Design a protein around this nucleic acid. Structure first.
Lengths: 49, 49, 414, 200
DNA sequence: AGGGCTGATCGTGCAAAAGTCGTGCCAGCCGTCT
DNA sequence: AGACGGCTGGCACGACTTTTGCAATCGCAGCCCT
């Protein structure tokens, strides 16, 4: 929660208003952006399990 | 990063895709024309530089 | 004097003609064409950004839609309503356009209307107005009913928009049977209904202008300077120029020479376009300095043949390449043809024009009773008083050109 | 699209357990490659419109700010798979606009500043048979011997540009010698590391 | 052995058919006071 | 409670513009066709 990417800000606000108080691990959204990198995905041996 | 509004001043966000398309299309055209090895090689050097 | 022998050239057609035809085009038309041409010649030469948020413009409406509980289809329809909103704040594309583009039977008119009504007034009130009018009704209903004269305002806004369009207060009072001048409070409240609540943000309409020159009017004698940065520069690849003579192969040298000749012709064409434009622009700025200074009201009758005779401008190359030239000056941004004003009659060796007439008619209609605008006959009288002598036929015709209601149609209750 | 799951499918995430980082082959590289843009222009103040096949261009790098297109056709979030003819770009969420790199080909190689520059100069291992000669090969200026047993030249033998010309003149059309990569890296490309491992 | 025949080069207008404005002109119409 | 009246725009004609659609025969001399 505590920074900048307002993308899950909407989800956080909706969950809190619902009192859901829930979050999704997802990816460093910025490391998902670093995959966007990945030498342009050049390095994607990423064996997500 | 437009500080003043009139000019954006992309703080280190230049795109070389200009050079990409330029060199690739030029190589495609001159390849059918049996381009000089010198011009082909200079394009090669700058192409992957 | 008489006839005997003596006397004695010619131009070129096709290739030179094509190069010349390229210049009559627009500025960016020439720029994109130059890019496409240079695509061939081998012998020529902090992730993102954002604006106001929460206050996030149309995207703020999209987020407030994303800020409420809705299903996938409701969110998709709200997004179709929001993304299909123009710079005026209303829903740019109606529900029917979205249904046709989707082609989805699951998304229906009822479902789309429900999703849009859930998104009718969230941030701010009256977004995706879909022809604001029911948006005005939504603003009135969302506004507290405790406001006085709200019933009269609602009755007027329901189906009396046409009567208010003509500013016919008498017709409105006769139709709605409203108490005279008691509906005035309701009408004034309707005037302050915050139209373009969407445009309040959506009117972030950006300003676009690429004048082909700048007239600095440097100490008078309006100094026209060509937009050299906007003037492209054609560079020849000198490395190819040094890599062809050494070519022991004749075919490569011949192809290089032909490419060089074509590129030189193109560069000369662009340069000639620029130079002729500069000369004619100086001539016009001399002619339209009164139009440049006092304005379109003092816009003199300017013609190409007269300008060509006055500045010794091209007799036909000018007539060709004159298309699409724009200038930024103290008056504003003006087109090339905008500089030349038509011819109108003036006695006593004086002369008259068209843009002058348009601005004068605008002033004269402004110089009319707010209840009763200036008649086309009255406009003719004003023009004759100015010495224009426009007469009623051209007066009505230009008022139609000026697109303003004249007396018997601009008539409003005082 | 029934639109009853398109937004539902929009929100998804993976476990990303035991992630690996390694090289690849160009197939996936062009698999990422989607668009084609031509110009280096940044932004046009003439019309305040995106560059056409330029930087931040349409038909490239993902969707548009709204589901509306730069040209103006198929301007709706409801239009999902329909592609307007005026400019071909996916009309969807702007999130994919961050999730779209491109690939640049230009059809020819040059120096990798990966080897011999870091604290470990992988140069020798990175260039393999070239052994720190890939940088020299990055000039297409030697056309070294590729193969040829008839000529008195090894397949993995250095033949500089003058050496290549002399080989072609003397050995005739028997001393095969190619550039790009020029000094040694092409013969590296035509090499097997199993014998090198056994020899080491 | 005699004829054909070939184009390598040969580049700032115009003209022509078309269109389009200026101004007029005209026909119905509505506010109203008769 | 129908005509006045100016609107007001449809309709008109010429009058100024205008855009496109337009490249050669050189020049020999060798080569091809006869």
């Amino acid at each position: 929660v505590k920074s900048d990417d307002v993308n899950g800000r909407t989800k956080m606000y909706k969950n809190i208003v619902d009192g859901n108080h829930q979050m999704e691990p997802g990816m460093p959204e910025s490391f998902n952006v670093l995959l966007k990198e990945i030498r342009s995905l050049g390095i994607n041996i990423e064996l997500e399990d | 990063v437009p500080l003043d509004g009139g000019r954006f001043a992309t703080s280190d966000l230049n795109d070389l895709y200009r050079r990409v398309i330029n060199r690739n299309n030029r190589l495609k055209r001159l390849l059918d024309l049996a381009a000089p090895d010198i011009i082909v090689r200079n394009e090669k050097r700058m192409l992957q530089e | 004097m008489k006839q005997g022998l003596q006397l004695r050239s010619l131009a070129m057609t096709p290739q030179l003609q094509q190069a010349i035809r390229l210049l009559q085009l627009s500025t960016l038309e020439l720029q994109q064409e130059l890019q496409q041409a240079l695509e061939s010649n081998p012998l020529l030469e902090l992730p993102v950004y954002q604006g106001e948020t929460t206050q996030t413009l149309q995207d703020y409406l999209m987020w407030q839609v994303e800020l409420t509980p809705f299903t996938d289809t409701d969110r998709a329809i709200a997004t179709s309503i929001v993304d299909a909103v123009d710079d005026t704040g209303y829903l740019t594309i109606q529900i029917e356009d979205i249904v046709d583009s989707i082609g989805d039977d699951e998304i229906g008119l009822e479902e789309v209307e429900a999703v849009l009504k859930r998104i009718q007034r969230f941030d701010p009130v009256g977004v995706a107005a879909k022809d604001l009018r029911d948006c005005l009704l939504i603003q009135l209903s969302q506004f507290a009913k405790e406001t006085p004269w709200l019933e009269e305002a609602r009755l007027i806004i329901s189906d009396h928009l046409d009567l208010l369009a003509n500013h016919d207060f008498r017709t409105l009072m006769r139709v709605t049977r409203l108490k005279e001048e008691v509906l005035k409070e309701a009408v004034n409240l309707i005037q302050s209904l915050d139209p373009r609540p969407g445009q309040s943000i959506q009117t972030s309409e950006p300003e676009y202008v690429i004048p082909d020159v700048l007239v600095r009017k440097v100490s008078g004698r309006w100094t026209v300077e060509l937009n050299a940065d906007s003037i492209p520069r054609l560079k020849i690849n000198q490395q190819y120029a040094a890599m062809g003579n050494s070519a022991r192969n004749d075919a490569d040298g011949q192809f290089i020479r032909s490419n060089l000749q074509e590129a030189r012709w193109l560069i000369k064409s662009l340069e000639s376009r620029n130079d002729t434009l500069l000369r004619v622009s100086r001539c016009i700025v001399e002619q339209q300095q009164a139009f440049f200074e006092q304005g379109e009201e003092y816009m003199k009758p300017m013609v190409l043949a007269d300008i060509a005779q006055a500045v010794e401008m091209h007799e036909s190359t000018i007539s060709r390449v004159t298309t699409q030239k724009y200038l930024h000056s103290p008056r504003g941004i003006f087109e090339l043809k905008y500089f030349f004003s038509s011819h109108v009659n003036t006695e006593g060796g004086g002369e008259a024009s068209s843009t002058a007439i348009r601005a004068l008619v605008k002033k004269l209609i402004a110089a009319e009773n707010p209840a009763k605008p200036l008649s086309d006959s009255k406009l003719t009288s004003m023009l004759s008083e100015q010495g224009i002598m426009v007469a009623r036929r051209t007066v009505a015709k230009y008022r139609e050109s000026l697109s303003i209601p004249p007396s018997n149609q601009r008539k409003q209750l005082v | 699209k029934d639109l009853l799951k398109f937004l539902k499918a929009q929100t998804k995430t993976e476990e990303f357990d035991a992630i690996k980082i390694a090289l690849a082959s160009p197939d996936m590289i062009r698999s990422w490659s989607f668009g084609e843009v031509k110009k280096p222009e940044t932004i046009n103040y003439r019309t305040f419109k995106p560059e056409r096949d330029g930087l931040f261009c349409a038909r490239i790098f993902g969707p548009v700010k709204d589901y509306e297109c730069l040209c103006g056709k198929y301007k709706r979030l409801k239009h999902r798979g329909v592609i307007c003819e005026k400019c071909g770009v996916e009309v969807t969420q702007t999130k994919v606009r961050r999730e779209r790199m491109g690939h640049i080909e230009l059809a020819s190689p040059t120096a990798h500043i990966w080897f011999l520059k870091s604290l470990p100069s992988r140069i020798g291992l990175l260039l393999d048979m070239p052994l720190r000669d890939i940088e020299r090969v990055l000039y297409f200026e030697s056309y070294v011997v590729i193969e040829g047993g008839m000529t008195n030249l090894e397949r993995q033998q250095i033949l500089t540009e003058e050496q290549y010309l002399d080989a072609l003149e003397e050995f005739g059309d028997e001393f095969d010698a190619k550039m790009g990569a020029e000094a040694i890296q092409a013969l590296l490309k035509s090499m097997d590391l199993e014998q090198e491992c056994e020899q080491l």
